[PDB]
Each structure stands twice: as C-alpha cells, then as structure tokens.
Design a protein around this ligand. Structure first.
Ligand SMILES: *C(=O)N1C[C@H](NOS(=O)(=O)O)CC[C@H]1C(N)=O
Length: 265
C-alpha cells in the first residue's frame, strides 16, 4: 500500500507530506493528504507565467521592464545582474521558472497589476480555472514565511495538480502560449533532486520547484511515460517540528516520486 509508504517517509524526515496524481484512462488518482493546505512557495510562478501569457499578445514578451536596487529583496540569480539594462517580460518568465528568480516574480505580479501588487489578479486567474482553494496574498519574500497551518499563500496537492493539468495538458492556454510554458518548465534548472530523481531517464519530466521556511519543499510536475502517456504529479512537504529554520529535505520528494513511479510504470 502506497499510504503506508508515504507515512514511513513522514516519520523518516519528521515531515508532513502531500501527494496528488489525478486519475487517467486506467489509473486511479493517487492521493495522500491531497486536500491539506501547503505553502505554494516558488511553485505559484508556473501559473503566474501562464496568467501573464494568457492576459497579453505574444509580442508583450518583447516589452522591456526596468527596475532598481530596492526591487531586489529575495533570491534572484538572474535579475540581480540586469538591474542596469532592464529585462524583457520573456526574460522575466524565463528566470521565474528556470531559476525561480523572486524579483522576476514580483515584477510579473506587477505586470499583471491590480490590488495586492497583482496578488488578487493572480488568485482570480486561478478562480477562472475552477480552483476555489488556492490563494496568494503576499509577494516575495513574504509568501514563504507564514507560520505552519496558516491559510495565506497556500494551495493543496489536489488543487495545484488540477491547475497544472489544465495549463500544460488541457486548453487553458492557446497552443503557442502552452508550448512556451511547457518548454520553460522542461528547461528548469532547480528540480534535479526532486520529482526528476524519482522517475527513470526515459520518462520526460517538466517541473516547477519551491522551497520555504519551516522545512518546506515542493515540486509540481507533468511527466510522460516512454510511450507518451502524461501524468501530473504534485508533491508538497513541510517540517513544522524543526521550527522556522528547519532544513527542507529534497530527498523526501525524490523518495515519494519513486514510490509514485513504481505505481505508474
Ligand atoms: C521559491 O520557493 N524560492 C525562491 C528561490 N528559488 O526556488 S527553489 O528553491 O525551489 O529552487 C529560493 C527558495 C525560495 C524562496 N525562499 O523564495
């Protein structure tokens, strides 16, 4: 039984674990704490980019965005460099997904616009996809810091997996926008030790990671079998037992994915 295996992992890492894989043709949904809330962390950045793509003509990608020193207030491996030149929307999407740049994310939030620096429009984008559970309330760095249990800035394995399914595999976006999102996620640089480590090499994996305080570590993926059958995999965890400075534990997500890969194979 999968639930027995997920529970052992929780004991091993002193963690809380959530897992969701929607049903397909022939496979039942895999669910474990799938409706408990977990911090989004950097994982909102995948549907944030979709929201931005959806809202604008493709050539909006070429629009140059300028920003300064006081706009850098979280891990931002790409944006820290180009504060002189500015960055285009396309570059910002690229960094937000592949590098989980937080400044890219804040700037895309502002591009989307409206109250909460764009956090209301982000959340309404999710509503339009039938997700009535997720909420974004703060931008970077504040969104990774809410105490354990607190509903702000949370989604559920169940909710984000249905979002991601619509985004990459359904018709939420037109195909040309769909392919852009899909390809940034394919080229992600931060997930090697997460869902990716759980599936064999001949499976395609695309993903968006997240990491936060209280030992938070997440990964949302779409994976394709060697014969091209897709599944959506959402893994979320935290370790409230360590307190604010608990270490996230990637190996936890890689072990849970392997458990899921052995079922799906
Ligand atoms: C996202 O969750 N974050 C932004 C940045 N990169 O995401 S990743 O850790 O999953 O690769 C650093 C960690 C985190 C954050 N604390 O903002």
């Amino acid at each position: 039984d999968l639930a027995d295996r997920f529970a052992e992992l929780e004991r091993r890492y002193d963690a809380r674990l959530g897992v969701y894989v929607p049903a397909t043709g022939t496979t039942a949904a895999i669910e474990y704490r799938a409706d408990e809330r977990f911090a989004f962390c950097s994982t909102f950045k995948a549907p944030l980019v979709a929201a931005v793509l959806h809202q604008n003509p493709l050539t909006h990608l070429d629009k140059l965005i300028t920003y300064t020193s006081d706009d850098i207030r979280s891990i931002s491996p790409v944006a820290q460099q180009h504060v002189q030149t500015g960055m285009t929307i396309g570059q910002l999407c690229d960094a937000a997904i592949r590098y989980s740049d937080g400044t890219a994310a804040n700037l895309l939030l502002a591009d989307l616009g409206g109250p909460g620096g764009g956090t209301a429009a982000f959340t309404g984008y999710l509503r339009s996809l039938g997700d009535t559970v997720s909420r974004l309330d703060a931008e970077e760095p504040e969104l990774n810091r809410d105490p354990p249990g607190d509903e702000r800035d949370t989604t559920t394995p169940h909710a984000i997996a249905l979002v991601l399914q619509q985004l990459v595999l359904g018709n939420a976006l037109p195909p040309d926008k769909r392919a852009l999102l899909t390809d940034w996620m394919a080229r992600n640089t931060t997930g090697a030790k997460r869902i990716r480590a759980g599936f064999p090499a001949d499976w395609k994996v695309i993903d968006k990671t997240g990491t936060g305080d209280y030992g938070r570590a997440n990964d949302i993926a779409v994976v394709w079998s060697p014969t091209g059958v897709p599944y959506v995999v959402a893994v979320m965890s935290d370790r409230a037992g360590g307190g604010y400075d608990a270490e996230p534990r990637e190996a936890l997500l890689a072990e849970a994915a392997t458990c899921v890969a052995g079922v799906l194979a």
